[PDB]
């Protein structure tokens, strides 16, 4: 069989490395040497703790790994382009930090987006990447944003996020619609954040060819809801991820999970305060208070990713070849 996808050295970065580092934070530890890191990406409109701190810093410490994450400056709302040089510095990093082993990474919305556009472009990663477990990801964009001709001043990743932009569509042109690693995908039919999702099927922004495609509902009924921000904390949720985790596929088992699973709340090993944090996250809704970049066109992709959205339209006119 085959399966296509950019080859070569890594493109260079915009920022500079020191910058990179400067976005990279490791709970207890530095990236110049870390035991059993893992790499948490976070959502648009968040920093690396407001994504994570009710959920999966304590949870990934407790199932035994140093929680790592990356917080692109102003709150994941820069280029999502820019976003991914965090992660691919940081995996880097922590790759080599770890003694050149590779190390999970873990995402929510965005953020996984951002893995799969760093693993797409960026192949020096591939082979530093253990798994990829990622919650509500929009590989799609979303249909919720926008649509494309209604986005004036809207801050750049919400340009890009938006369903049929062109930086959606060199993702899949390029390939980065199938997993590149062992993938794990959850996500929800009932996301008000991230549609189309209720399908169970590729039409779903978080699905991944190969991927371990999570629906919830398709494990625990068409009336199980489950919102955005408990897709990323709620008891299924962390089963479903111990598992990927653990497994040694690289992918969450279905012999892991189960109907028995099906609790939306947050997760039960968390401290009551930490499921209070996780019941009333807002994370998800941050971006439409805090301060973006002032964006009046879809950003222009970089040299690597432009050759695969031929005729869509970003800052500089509509790509050629």
């Given at each position: 069989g085959a399966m296509a996808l950019p080859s070569g050295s890594d493109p260079a970065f915009s920022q500079p490395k020191s910058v990179l580092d400067a976005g990279l934070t490791c709970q207890g530890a530095s990236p110049s040497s870390v035991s059993k890191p893992i790499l948490l990406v976070p959502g648009t409109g968040t920093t690396g703790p407001q994504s994570f701190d009710s959920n999966w810093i304590p949870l990934s410490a407790q199932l035994g790994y140093t929680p790592c994450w990356i917080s692109p400056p102003p709150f994941m709302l820069n280029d999502t382009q820019v976003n991914t040089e965090y992660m691919v510095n940081a995996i880097t990093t922590l790759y080599a930090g770890s003694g050149n082993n590779k190390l999970p990474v873990l995402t929510v919305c965005q953020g996984g987006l951002v893995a799969q556009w760093g693993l797409t472009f960026f192949?020096?990663?591939r082979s530093k990447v253990d798994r990829l477990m990622a919650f509500a990801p929009d590989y799609k964009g979303t249909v919720l944003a926008g649509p494309l001709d209604a986005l004036a001043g809207s801050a750049p990743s919400v340009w890009q996020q938006t369903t049929g932009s062109a930086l959606t569509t060199a993702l899949r042109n390029a390939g980065g619609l199938t997993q590149i690693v062992p993938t794990t995908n959850l996500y929800s039919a009932t996301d008000e954040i991230v549609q189309p999702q209720v399908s169970n099927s590729p039409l779903d922004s978080s699905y991944l060819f190969n991927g371990k495609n999570v629906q919830a509902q398709a494990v625990c009924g068409p009336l199980f809801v489950i919102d955005h921000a408990g897709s990323l904390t709620s008891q299924f949720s962390y089963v479903v991820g111990?598992?990927?985790?653990?497994?040694?596929?690289?992918?969450?088992?279905?012999?892991?999970?189960?109907?028995?699973?099906?609790?939306?709340?947050?997760?039960?090993?968390?401290?009551?305060?930490?499921?209070?944090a996780a019941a009333a996250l807002l994370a998800p809704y941050y971006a439409a208070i805090v301060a973006g970049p002032k964006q009046n066109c879809e950003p222009d992709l970089m040299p690597y990713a432009r050759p695969f959205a031929v005729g869509k339209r970003t800052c500089s006119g509509i790509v050629t070849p």
């Open positions: 192949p020096s990663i111990r598992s990927a985790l653990r497994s040694t596929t690289g992918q969450a088992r279905s012999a892991d999970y189960g109907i028995t699973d099906c609790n939306p709340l947050p997760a039960n090993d968390l401290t009551p305060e930490q499921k209070v």
